[PDB]
Design a protein around this ligand. Structure first.
Ligand SMILES: [Zn+2]
Lengths: 512, 319, 75
């Protein structure tokens, strides 16, 4: 086993806007919808329609880490997602909820691949594994006589960062840190080719319908064109200074739209390189791009960056820029990017992506104050606290929102007097409190099993909407819920199955 | 010419004697030790003792003989509880203690006058590494510079020391459970990590990591692999500076550890003086031809059985 | 903060530490990943063998520092 930890997230109940960057994008032409895969763990649905003050439709919240890739399939009915939490999740795309979680990957799941004709999806990641998924089987709610087997490709010698298939599902390729592309035929699961060429990692793959020709975007800076039939690189395009992360192609397979670390997006005629249209200079590095495919002159392109806003840039004109201002902009929110823990081990200072500064109470699980763009290191010294308290929690900023994590090894290290905590403690004179215990009790307050024949710790409550997460240390997530919903019956049942013994002792048995 | 003197073993002090002989046959180190005069004439330290011992060998009347280093050993034992016994110790740990202890003494002398300058220990032995860590999502490079007095290099079977140095400076991928916390990405990601020599030392001390811990069986073994060391060694940096360095080094001393295991054994230094080779085994001094040096590469076969094997190599920058 | 240790085979592990951590704390974290008992460990950094009673800030050890791990051949 691994140790199981308890986490919570300091956030508003609904986070309309991405609170970190966005790694992937999908368009439903039919419904005029854009899916963004968050690095704030959240997948979102937007309408791509005229002058709506909120293009916001909905948040799909299940993942506990970056959502790295999303595929849309079965006529926009189902969404498949890959995450750094090591799970592939299956969603009803119309309703916006999670049908299944796949747990076959043992590391970050980095990429997805879609063969539209076969309704086939593939996942790959850092564990050097590739699994093949029949989507109709994944979404069938019927009882099946077939035992639900999986098939895996094998071959990669290190971590996989990009993956692609053709419409037919004739061929599949992966880009890994081992520089080669590797090629399989899905339906056979057999290796056809290994392609040598790139000198660095490759994060972007596209194929033509036929599975005869491939484009690959690399951190070495080169775009490449391949003949699968000839098993050889046939062209190599040096359009960027730094790595290429994102490629789109036109319907015809003649122009490539490329993006990367150097913030500059270029349409580029494959047949003759020299003609290159510098579309735009984005404010941050380009992670992924999605072509609007209404027209054969593809009208616009949607671009995902390390920033939380998403832009559509028009292609209406077709080495200064075509465009200088976003055709359409989806609002972003701020990521918290710096965290300092004071010596009292109760207060946090943060600086966010908008250089804003805030003061937070970890124990009471809430913002104390907004300080609006002061000098941050000064502020740390300005609020210095001459106390020794041992460390009892860690902070995680991977999603852009504050995630506090409690682990057995030191959850209970911190013993503090009630007056020093600043609690009324009106009766008589005050005692030793253990901050870990008090917080766990606040988190699991609504859980019926805590109550003894009074509720919680008594001294305070968390925001009732505070999500609480149980998960293995750098491993899979066992369960998540909102603090207030632990009073539900199904929720209580899951709490019995997942809350580990060490938490039980304090919260229900009422030990130290 | 010169003096060739063995050192008496007192209990189990070969870890110490072997290292003294290496260091005495590092001319630059020897000369600076002979030249040492204290800023405060008053008080006796590990350096004054090394200095008295070295004068004694250097100003001895006959060409060959034996010194008992009573007074250095006594001072060693007084300074360091780890060596205050008759138990066998590790030569490399002593070399590190010694050099740093001297360096600390000389640094105090500099400060003493004024009532972050480098001592001649650092001058002779210090090099510098640049460690680069490339985050694989964001593709940022983070560079940190770290000084060293020696390189402790891992070994593998039937290779040269030059291959080991290559191994040391190769790009490793931090992944799986060793992911890099990247401040850009605010998350753990895979990383490319490389340590490259940024600045070469006048004398390159190599420490061969001849140990393997068995996690299952709760103890470690001694690696007696063949690891070959050439008499001349060529090192370099790649581009990025006013000056590119491509330097020959000559082998001047090997501290050899004899035995089949890590917890006990014997130490002997081989050294080069005036282009031929001597072997010092405490009091015994014996001259050997250059080919005899290959016994100390280690065993091709019967690896479990008893070996005599290079452990610390001193390479001197050609001059 | 995160630091590295280069272990006996060459492989690098990561450790989560704080500047106030003692070298003993550090060797325990090594032990967790590597099995090697603190008393058999030696760590070299900036050319110094690190002393059990001292802290990482005592040696100015900062994020991304590499410690070199070695055992002993007694003799
Ligand atoms: Zn990064």
């Amino acid at each position: 086993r691994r140790k199981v930890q308890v986490s919570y997230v300091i956030r508003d109940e609904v986070e309309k806007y991405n609170r970190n960057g966005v790694n992937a994008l999908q368009l439903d032409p039919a419904l005029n919808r854009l899916f963004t895969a968050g690095r704030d763990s959240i997948i979102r649905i937007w309408s791509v329609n005229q002058h709506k003050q909120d293009p916001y439709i909905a948040s799909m919240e299940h993942h506990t880490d970056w959502v790295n890739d999303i595929v849309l399939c079965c006529n926009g009915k189902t969404l498949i997602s890959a995450s750094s939490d090591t799970t592939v999740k299956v969603w009803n795309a119309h309703k916006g909820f999670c049908m299944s979680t796949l747990r076959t990957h043992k590391d970050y799941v980095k990429a997805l691949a879609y063969a539209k004709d076969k309704e086939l999806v593939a996942s790959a990641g850092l564990d050097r594994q590739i699994f093949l998924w029949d989507v109709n089987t994944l979404t069938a709610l019927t009882a099946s006589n077939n035992t639900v087997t999986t098939s895996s490709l094998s071959g990669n010698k290190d971590s996989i960062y990009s993956l692609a298939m053709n419409q037919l599902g004739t061929i599949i390729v992966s880009g890994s840190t081992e520089k080669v592309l590797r090629v399989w035929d899905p339906r056979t699961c057999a290796k056809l080719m290994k392609l040598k060429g790139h000198t660095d990692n490759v994060k972007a793959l596209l194929l033509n319908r036929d599975g005869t020709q491939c484009l690959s975007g690399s951190s070495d800076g080169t775009i490449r064109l391949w003949s699968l039939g000839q098993q050889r690189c046939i062209a190599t395009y040096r359009v960027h200074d730094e790595g290429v992360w994102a490629l789109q192609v036109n319907d015809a397979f003649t122009h490539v739209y490329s993006g990367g670390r150097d913030r500059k997006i270029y349409c580029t005629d494959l047949r003759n390189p020299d003609i290159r249209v510098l579309i735009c200079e984005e404010k941050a590095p380009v992670l992924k791009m999605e072509l609007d495919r209404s027209a054969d002159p593809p009208p616009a392109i949607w671009v995902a960056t390390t920033k939380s806003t998403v832009n559509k840039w028009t292609l209406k004109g077709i080495i200064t820029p075509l465009c200088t201002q976003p055709d359409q902009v989806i609002k972003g929110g701020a990521s918290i990017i710096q965290c300092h823990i004071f010596n009292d081990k109760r207060h946090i200072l943060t600086k966010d992506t908008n250089n804003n500064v805030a003061y937070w109470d970890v124990l009471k699980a809430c913002k104390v104050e907004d300080l609006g763009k002061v000098d941050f290191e000064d502020e740390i010294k300005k609020r210095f606290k001459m106390v020794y308290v041992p460390n009892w929690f860690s902070v995680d900023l991977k999603t852009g929102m504050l995630t506090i994590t409690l682990d057995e090894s030191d959850c209970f290290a911190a013993w503090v007097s009630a007056k020093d905590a600043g609690f009324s403690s009106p009766d008589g004179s005050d005692p030793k409190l253990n901050l870990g215990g008090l917080l766990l009790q606040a988190l699991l307050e609504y859980w019926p099993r805590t109550h003894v024949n009074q509720k919680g710790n008594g001294y305070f409550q968390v925001p009732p909407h505070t999500p609480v997460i149980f998960g293995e240390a750098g491993g899979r997530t066992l369960f998540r819920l909102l603090c207030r919903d632990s009073g539900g019956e199904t929720e209580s049942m899951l709490l019995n199955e997942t809350v580990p013994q060490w938490v039980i002792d304090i919260t229900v048995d009422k030990n130290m | 010419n010169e003096h060739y003197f063995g050192l008496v073993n007192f209990g189990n002090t070969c870890y110490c004697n072997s290292v003294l002989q290496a260091l005495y046959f590092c001319r630059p180190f020897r000369e600076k030790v002979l030249a040492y005069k204290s800023q405060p004439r008053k008080k006796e330290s590990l350096l004054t003792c090394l200095a008295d011992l070295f004068h004694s060998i250097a100003t001895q009347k006959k060409k060959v003989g034996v010194i008992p280093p009573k007074k250095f050993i006594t001072r060693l034992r007084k300074e360091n509880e780890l060596f205050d016994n008759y138990m066998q110790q590790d030569a490399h740990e002593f070399l590190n203690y010694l050099l740093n202890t001297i360096a600390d003494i000389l640094q105090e002398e500099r400060k003493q006058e004024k009532q972050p300058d480098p001592t001649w220990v650092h001058e002779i032995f210090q090099g510098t590494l640049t460690n680069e860590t490339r985050c694989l999502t964001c593709e940022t490079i983070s560079s940190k510079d770290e000084d060293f007095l020696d390189l402790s290099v891992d070994v593998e079977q039937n290779t040269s020391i030059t291959h080991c140095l290559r191994g040391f400076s190769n790009t490793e991928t931090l992944c799986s459970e060793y992911k890099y916390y990247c401040e850009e990405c605010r998350s753990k990601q895979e990383a490319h990590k490389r340590m490259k020599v940024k600045k070469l030392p006048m004398i390159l001390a190599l420490h061969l990591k001849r140990f393997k811990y068995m996690d299952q069986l709760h103890r470690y073994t001694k690696l007696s692999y063949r690891v070959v060391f050439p008499l001349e060694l060529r090192l370099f940096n790649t581009s990025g500076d006013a000056t590119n360095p491509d330097r020959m080094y000559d082998l001047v001393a090997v501290v050899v550890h004899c035995g089949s295991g890590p917890n006990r054994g014997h130490y002997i230094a081989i050294v080069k003086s005036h282009d031929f080779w001597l072997l010092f085994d405490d009091d015994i001094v014996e001259k050997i031809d250059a080919q005899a040096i290959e016994e100390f590469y280690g065993l091709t076969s019967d690896i479990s059985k008893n070996s005599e094997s290079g452990y610390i190599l001193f390479y001197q920058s050609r001059d | 903060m995160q630091i590295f240790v280069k272990t006996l085979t060459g492989k690098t592990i990561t450790l989560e530490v704080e500047p106030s951590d003692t070298i003993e704390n550090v060797k325990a974290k090594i032990q967790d990943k590597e099995g090697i008992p603190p008393d058999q460990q030696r760590l070299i950094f900036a050319g110094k063998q690190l002393e059990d009673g001292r802290t990482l800030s005592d040696y100015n050890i900062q994020k991304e520092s590499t410690l070199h791990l070695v055992l002993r051949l007694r003799g």
